[PDB]
Amino acid sequence: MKPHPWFFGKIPRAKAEEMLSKQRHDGAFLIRESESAPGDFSLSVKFGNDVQHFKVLRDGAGKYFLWVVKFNSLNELVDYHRSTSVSRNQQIFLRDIE
Amino acid sequence: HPWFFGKIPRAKAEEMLSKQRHDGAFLIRESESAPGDFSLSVKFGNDVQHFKVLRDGAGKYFLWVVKFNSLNELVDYHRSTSVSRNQQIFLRDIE
């Protein structure tokens, strides 16, 4: 076992960008404990000339997630899955019956 | 919608889908084992897979609820599944 080199504890958002901007591979990331939102975790990631931050969300059950993807209609769900797999273990993309 | 097939039975959806050549060929039908629900049937290989269209209190539509029990699992998951919706960002260890 080795400590996870991506957990940085409490460090300023600015210092995380400064640090990650020096990285050369898109995706270089770190998890930090937010200062502006006590109790929350933030994901900082390098991408191009920027550094993006994602707030780690939670639900009443204590789950951790970045997005809640749902739709208002079946047609909206259909379009989404034309480019995003409908399966978790396989890559299946919806395409019209011909 | 041309992908909606109303009350076609699960068995008939399979017969129909099994004759399509492209993986991904699908149709949405009213669930037969669960009245009121919707089912997505899709071809893949020599099989036809069925998915239940899930709903929530707000009456939303989704196939899966992807969540994690720990930051550790959320991180590892996004090492192969993008963190961004509009860009391809896969978590990679700092070097």
């Binding site: 399966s87 978790r88 | 089912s39 897979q49 069925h50 998915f51 239940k52 899930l54 196939l63 899966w64």
Partner: peptide
Amino acid sequence: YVNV
């Protein structure tokens, strides 16, 4: 169903 694959997802249930």
